[PDB]
Amino acid sequence: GVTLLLASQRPSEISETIFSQCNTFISMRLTNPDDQNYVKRLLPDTVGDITNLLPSLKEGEALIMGDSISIPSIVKIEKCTIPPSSIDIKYLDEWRKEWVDSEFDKIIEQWSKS
Amino acid sequence: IDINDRFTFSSLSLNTKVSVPVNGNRFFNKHIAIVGSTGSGKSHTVAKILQKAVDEKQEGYKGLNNSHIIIFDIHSEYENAFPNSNVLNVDTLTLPYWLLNGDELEELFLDTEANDHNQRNVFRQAITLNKKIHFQGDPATKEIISFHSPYYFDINEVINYINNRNNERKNKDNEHIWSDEEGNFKFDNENAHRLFKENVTPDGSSAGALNGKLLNFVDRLQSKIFDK
Amino acid sequence: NDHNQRNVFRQAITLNKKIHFQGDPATKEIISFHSPYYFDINEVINYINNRNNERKNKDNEHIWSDEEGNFKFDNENAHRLFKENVTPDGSSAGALNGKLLNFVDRLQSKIFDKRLDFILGEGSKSVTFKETLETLISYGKDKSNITILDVSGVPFEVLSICVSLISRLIFEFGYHSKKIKRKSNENQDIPILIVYEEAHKYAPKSDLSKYRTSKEAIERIAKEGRKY
Amino acid sequence: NDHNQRNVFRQAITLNKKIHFQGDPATKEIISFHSPYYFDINEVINYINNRNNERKNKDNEHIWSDEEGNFKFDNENAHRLFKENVTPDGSSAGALNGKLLNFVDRLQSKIFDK
Amino acid sequence: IDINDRFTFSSLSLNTKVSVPVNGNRFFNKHIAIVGSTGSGKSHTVAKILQKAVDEKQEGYKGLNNSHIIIFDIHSEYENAFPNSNVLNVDTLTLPYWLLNGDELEELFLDTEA
Amino acid sequence: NDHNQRNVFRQAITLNKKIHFQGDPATKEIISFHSPYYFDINEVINYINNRNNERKNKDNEHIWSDEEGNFKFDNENAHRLFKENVTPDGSSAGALNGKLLNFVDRLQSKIFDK
DNA sequence: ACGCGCATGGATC
DNA sequence: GATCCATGCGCGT
Numbered sequence: 001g002v003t004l005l006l007a008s009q010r011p012s013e014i015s016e017t018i019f020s021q022c023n024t025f026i027s028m029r030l031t032n033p034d035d036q037n038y039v040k041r042l043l044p045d046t047v048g049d050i051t052n053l054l055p056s057l058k059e060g061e062a063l064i065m066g067d068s069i070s071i072p073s074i075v076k077i078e079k080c081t082i083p084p085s086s087i088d089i090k091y092l093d094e095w096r097k098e099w100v101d102s103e104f105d106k107i108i109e110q111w112s113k114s
Numbered sequence: 115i116d117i118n119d120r121f122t123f124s125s126l127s128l129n130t131k132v133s134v135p136v137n138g139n140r141f142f143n144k145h146i147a148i149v150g151s152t153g154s155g156k157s158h159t160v161a162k163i164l165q166k167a168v169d170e171k172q173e174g175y176k177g178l179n180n181s182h183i184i185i186f187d188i189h190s191e192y193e194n195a196f197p198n199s200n201v202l203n204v205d206t207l208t209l210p211y212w213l214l215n216g217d218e219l220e221e222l223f224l225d226t227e228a229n230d231h232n233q234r235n236v237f238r239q240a241i242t243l244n245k246k247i248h249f250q251g252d253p254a255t256k257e258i259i260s261f262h263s264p265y266y267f268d269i270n271e272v273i274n275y276i277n278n279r280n281n282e283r284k285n286k287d288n289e290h291i292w293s294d295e296e297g298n299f300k301f302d303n304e305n306a307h308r309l310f311k312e313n314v315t316p317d318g319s320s321a322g323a324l325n326g327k328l329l330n331f332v333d334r335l336q337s338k339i340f341d342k
Numbered sequence: 343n344d345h346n347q348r349n350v351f352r353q354a355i356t357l358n359k360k361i362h363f364q365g366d367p368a369t370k371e372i373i374s375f376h377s378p379y380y381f382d383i384n385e386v387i388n389y390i391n392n393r394n395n396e397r398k399n400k401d402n403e404h405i406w407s408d409e410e411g412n413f414k415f416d417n418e419n420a421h422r423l424f425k426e427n428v429t430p431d432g433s434s435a436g437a438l439n440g441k442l443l444n445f446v447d448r449l450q451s452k453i454f455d456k457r458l459d460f461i462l463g464e465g466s467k468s469v470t471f472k473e474t475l476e477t478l479i480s481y482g483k484d485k486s487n488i489t490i491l492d493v494s495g496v497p498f499e500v501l502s503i504c505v506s507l508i509s510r511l512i513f514e515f516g517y518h519s520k521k522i523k524r525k526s527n528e529n530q531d532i533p534i535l536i537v538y539e540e541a542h543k544y545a546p547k548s549d550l551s552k553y554r555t556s557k558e559a560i561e562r563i564a565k566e567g568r569k570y
Numbered sequence: 571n572d573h574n575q576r577n578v579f580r581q582a583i584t585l586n587k588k589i590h591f592q593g594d595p596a597t598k599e600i601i602s603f604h605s606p607y608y609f610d611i612n613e614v615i616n617y618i619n620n621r622n623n624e625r626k627n628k629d630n631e632h633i634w635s636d637e638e639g640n641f642k643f644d645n646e647n648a649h650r651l652f653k654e655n656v657t658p659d660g661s662s663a664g665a666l667n668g669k670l671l672n673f674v675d676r677l678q679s680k681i682f683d684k
Numbered sequence: 685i686d687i688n689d690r691f692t693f694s695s696l697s698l699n700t701k702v703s704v705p706v707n708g709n710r711f712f713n714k715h716i717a718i719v720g721s722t723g724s725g726k727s728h729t730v731a732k733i734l735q736k737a738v739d740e741k742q743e744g745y746k747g748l749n750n751s752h753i754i755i756f757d758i759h760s761e762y763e764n765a766f767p768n769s770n771v772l773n774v775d776t777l778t779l780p781y782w783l784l785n786g787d788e789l790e791e792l793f794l795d796t797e798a
Numbered sequence: 799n800d801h802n803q804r805n806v807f808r809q810a811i812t813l814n815k816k817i818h819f820q821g822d823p824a825t826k827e828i829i830s831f832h833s834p835y836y837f838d839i840n841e842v843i844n845y846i847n848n849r850n851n852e853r854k855n856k857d858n859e860h861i862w863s864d865e866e867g868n869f870k871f872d873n874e875n876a877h878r879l880f881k882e883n884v885t886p887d888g889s890s891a892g893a894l895n896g897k898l899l900n901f902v903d904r905l906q907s908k909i910f911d912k
Numbered sequence: 913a914c915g916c917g918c919a920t921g922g923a924t925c
Numbered sequence: 926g927a928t929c930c931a932t933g934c935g936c937g938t
């Protein structure tokens with residue numbers, strides 16, 4: 001009754017002993033060819049042509065395979081109405097404003113706490 | 115997939131009107147590995163699957179279902195996705211040191227390797243004895259208490275045990291004699307529980323088996339205890 | 343088997359960080375080995391050299407004498423080993439007696455290394471945490487959008503630690519800025535771009551030891567850096 | 571990859587470059603192991619060969635005796651180990667006693683080669 | 685495979701009504717390695733092999749045959765697969781310490797060496 | 799790869815090469831273990847065999863006896879250790895006592911091998 | 913004489 | 926490098 005959900009940023013950097021036991025596989029955009037070859041060999045040769053769409057995947061588009069799904073298919077995950085607190089930083093929009101005072105006293109006080 | 119075992123959290127990319135359900139039992143009993151580049155929606159998808167598991171309730175009630183999910187969240191992001199959840203940090207979570215079995219008691223506390231056989235022995239014998247002393251159940255369970263038993267022991271009196279045995283003094287009969295408020299006694303299995311306190315004064319003629327050979331052991335052990 | 347030098351290394355640094363702290367002494371207790379607080383590195387040598395000369399008595403406790411007088415080596419008097427003007431009184435060699443001669447001799451070689459003068463020089467005493475961080479991102483008296491790090495004709499040994507420290511210091515500045523803003527429900531307002539020109543030097547494909555400590559400094563920025 | 575052999579090599583050559591410098595003291599302090607200054611390799615071997623025979627006393631300090639009298643091995647008197655005519659005087663084995671003999675025999679194997 | 689050499693426990697995947705017997709003498713004397721991902725069915729396959737080995741009885745007698753199978757059960761599965769079997773947990777199994785052949789007697793009692 | 803056999807073999811051989819060397823003294827200090835000049839290997843046997851008879855007195859010195867007189871273990875007096883007719887005088891065992899017998903037996907085996 | 917204490921040493925991993 | 930162990934020498938009854 002104890003299973004795992006492995007969330008990792010590259011398939012070729014986690015140990016195979018944990019990774020091989022994961023029958024259910026969710027694959028998002030993978031620009032590394034070593035990763036796409038790892039997703040290639042997890043598939044049969046008949047459904048081996050869908051992984052060519054891996055580096056072209058948009059945000060929220062995933063490739064799901066395993067005994068849970070009928071066929072390995074590229075799916076669009078439902079948008080999170082209550083999302084995690086991970087918002088991308090608008091670098092151009094932040095840099096366009098003025099120089100900030102940036103409160104150095106509070107940062108290194110909290111840094112020294114940790 | 116049958117009607118009851120369907121688990122939907124996504125639709126087909128080419129056809130948004132086509133829903134893609136997976137076998138919810140087979141989705142979770144066999145482990146899930148979700149991978150992708152940075153910004154690909156991996157953390158949002160993990161939260162989305164966890165949310166669909168939480169509201170996966172059979173008809174007949176309103177309260178919480180039987181979902182039990184533990185998140186090792188290293189970016190402080192999943193608190194927002196689950197506002198009705200319990201969030202634990204190191205400053206508040208308490209995982210007791212006496213819940214370790216034999217393997218991680220040596221891994222957390224002992225940094226010596228391959229030449230520490232007397233230091234390993236006084237470590238397990240202090241812990242096993244202290245677990246037996248604080249036990250309050252039936253005596254039949256008391257004697258099966260061993261080194262890996264998840265029972266409470268005081269690591270401060272464990273240090274007191276190795277500190278006392280660091281000053282042990284044997285007599286002419288090669289037996290260790292101690293003195294405390296109760297009186298003189300001999301170090302054996304029925305009296306070694308009196309070494310967990312620091313008001314015990316050794317009495318003897320010659321140095322014991324561990325006299326002076328545990329000073330660096332206590333210093334390394336007290337460093338891990340006092341490490342914040 | 344380097345666990346007693348490793349123990350006495352952090353014990354010297356953690357203690358010296360507490361004595362050189364002049365503030366709220368509730369914070370003084372949570373100062374530890376990785377805390378970014380000032381400690382005298384020469385006083386650390388004074389601690390380890392004394393610990394090499396230590397001598398325990400019959401009771402297994404190390405005794406010392408300085409200009410003030412005789413005292414016991416415990417947590418409340420370990421700060422008096424930071425000066426050379428101490429004489430050990432005892433009947434037997436202590437726990438670390440004679441075990442730190444090559445440890446000190448190797449460690450002073452790092453301090454008097456002129457390659458490492460920007461880190462272990464006499465100028466590290468005067469600067470504080472705030473001045474170092476404003477220097478890195480040009481937040482001092484003169485302000486700049488671009489900070490250039492002139493490491494043109496510099497050896498790899500001090501190039502690698504320049505890269506690994508500053509990449510970590512900027513990352514943890516970016517990390518700790520986000521947690522400060524998350525208390526006020528705001529986002530990070532200092533986005534920092536670090537330019538690694540001719541990155542073949544410090545982050546190559548090969549897995550050598552001198553290539554190691556600068557690879558995960560850039561890997562951690564590559565992996566989880568854009569959140570902060 | 572012996573760090574005790576590495577440390578004794580640098581501390582011999584750095585010290586030997588100091589004693590043969592004839593110049594301004596401020597430049598003398600910045601002399602280190604990589605700095606391009608003259609040192610004599612025969613005295614460097616003698617320093618390492620002597621440090622194969624160190625004998626500490628009960629106060630953990632190495633004591634020797636050249637023709638001018640007994641001395642304690644410290645920063646000021648470490649240049650006296652460059653000469654061969656030093657005899658160790660102590661009770662216990664020194665800090666680098668017996669840890670540098672394979673270092674020395676290979677060191678003079680390359681010097682003596684024509 | 686000879687008619688007295690046949691030991692069938694499986695049928696072909698492409699065609700159900702054809703059995704795939706193996707050389708039973710060659711199946712068990714030459715060691716068996718069964719591998720597959722988690723939940724593939726290795727335990728059921730192992731249990732089915734040992735079940736067909738138990739009822740592999742030559743004609744002419746009643747009662748259990750000369751099979752001898754020892755299972756190292758670390759997940760407590762084969763008790764229900766073999767109801768008429770002997771189960772030995774640590775609390776009831778007694779292996780004498782004087783049965784050690786010296787080498788294990790050397791390693792059981794001394795955590796030190798050399 | 800016994801370390802302590804390696805050293806005594808070179809102090810036997812390098813010293814033996816200095817005794818039999820007939821050239822001018824200036825190249826006697828460049829004499830090493832890898833220098834191609836004559837040394838008598840039977841005297842190398844007699845050195846290592848005698849060093850296995852080392853006797854240490856109260857003041858930590860090795861004292862031998864010879865036809866010419868009695869001498870201590872000094873580098874000048876170590877040259878006369880190459881003869882088999884010496885007898886040790888002392889109180890206790892030496893530094894290399896009892897650990898070079900298998901080294902001598904291997905060396906005698908090679909030389910008396912046809 | 914023997915006992916205890918301390919120091920040196922080396923055996924390994 | 927540290928732990929462990931043994932052998933030895935010196936000072937005490």
Ligand SMILES: Nc1ncnc2c1ncn2[C@@H]1O[C@H](COP(=O)(O)OP(=O)(O)NP(=O)(O)O)[C@@H](O)[C@H]1O
Pocket residue numbers: 009059060061076077078079080084086087088150151152153154155156157158159565566
């Ligand atoms: N189903 C979706 N549809 C549309 N946009 C999405 C979807 N899921 C996620 N996103 C967007 O993708 C962004 C990146 O998602 P994120 O939660 O950072 O996953 P991530 O790839 O794991 N980030 P990281 O942990 O650094 O690798 C989010 O901020 C959303 O804006």
Ligand SMILES: Nc1ncnc2c1ncn2[C@@H]1O[C@H](COP(=O)(O)OP(=O)(O)NP(=O)(O)O)[C@@H](O)[C@H]1O
Pocket residue numbers: 720721722723724725726727728729
């Ligand atoms: N011949 C079979 N036909 C159909 N289902 C089978 C068969 N053999 C096993 N199973 C199924 O396999 C599952 C149990 O797998 P199991 O026999 O435990 O394999 P396993 O590899 O030993 N599991 P694990 O120990 O974690 O590796 C059940 O759902 C069974 O129904």
Ligand SMILES: [Mg+2]
Pocket residue numbers: 086156157158
């Ligand atoms: Mg994420």
Ligand SMILES: [Mg+2]
Pocket residue numbers: 726727
């Ligand atoms: Mg199984």
